[PDB]
């Protein structure tokens, strides 16, 4: 009586869904974009631009 998932599950509170920025994959996309900001912050890693 159990299934296994690769991501975290959490049941919804309401039946009318609407947009939020509080979950695991948005946190993931945020951390990836934060690394790319830290990578564009140096111009050693791209000297041509």
């Amino acid at each position: 009586e159990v299934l296994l998932l690769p991501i975290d599950h959490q049941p919804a509170n309401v039946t009318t869904p609407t947009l939020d920025f509080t979950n695991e994959l948005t946190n993931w996309r945020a951390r990836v974009c934060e690394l790319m900001k830290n990578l564009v912050d140096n111009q050693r890693y791209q000297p041509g631009w």
């Binding site: 000297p47 041509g48 631009w49």
Partner: protein, 49 residues
């Protein structure tokens, strides 16, 4: 011509043109280092012998 068949490496036809697209310039300039390269050196496989 004898080492031609022994040696494993051949020329990669597109290294030079796949490069110089990482760096670019404004089109407002009339001088171009990348097309200066591609007018300066001509690979043509006659370099190879």
């Amino acid at each position: 011509v004898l080492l031609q068949r022994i040696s494993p490496l051949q020329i990669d036809p597109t290294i030079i043109s796949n490069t110089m697209s990482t760096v670019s310039e404004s089109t407002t300039q009339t001088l171009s280092p990348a097309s200066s390269i591609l007018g300066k050196l001509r690979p043509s496989n006659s370099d190879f012998s």
